[PDB]
Task: structure prediction
Amino acid sequence: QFMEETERSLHDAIMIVRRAIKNDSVVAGGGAIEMELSKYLRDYSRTIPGKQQLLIGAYAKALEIIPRQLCDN
Amino acid sequence: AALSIYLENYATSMGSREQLAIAEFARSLLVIPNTLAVNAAQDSTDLVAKLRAFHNEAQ
Result:
């Protein structure tokens, strides 16, 4: 019952490695950018909004969930 | 609206959950102009979000 999750590491490696091939340009993974992406856009939750701060901010809230989930779970 | 952003700037700077603490305090600040949208029948975000839309620095 432990054996399935063992191989699923190898092909993802093969994939994401070939993905480092498929695209030589590689951003930081693991929810790295999405932290600032909030602040990056939440700048415009400050700047523009007519209503748009909820529109930008909730999305700024929406960006970090991928690390936020794995972190807090 | 400033005090939101004024504090919401001080939010992102502090860090950890107290960064989050400061930001959620910068939220409650915005209801007083929004309860003006109550009586004047204004549009709360178009009121308040555009209030926050006003700045060079926060002031």
Remarks:
- Chain B has four helices and no strands.
- The radius of gyration of chain B is 12 Å.
- The helical segments of chain B are 2-14, 16-28, 31-39, 44-52.
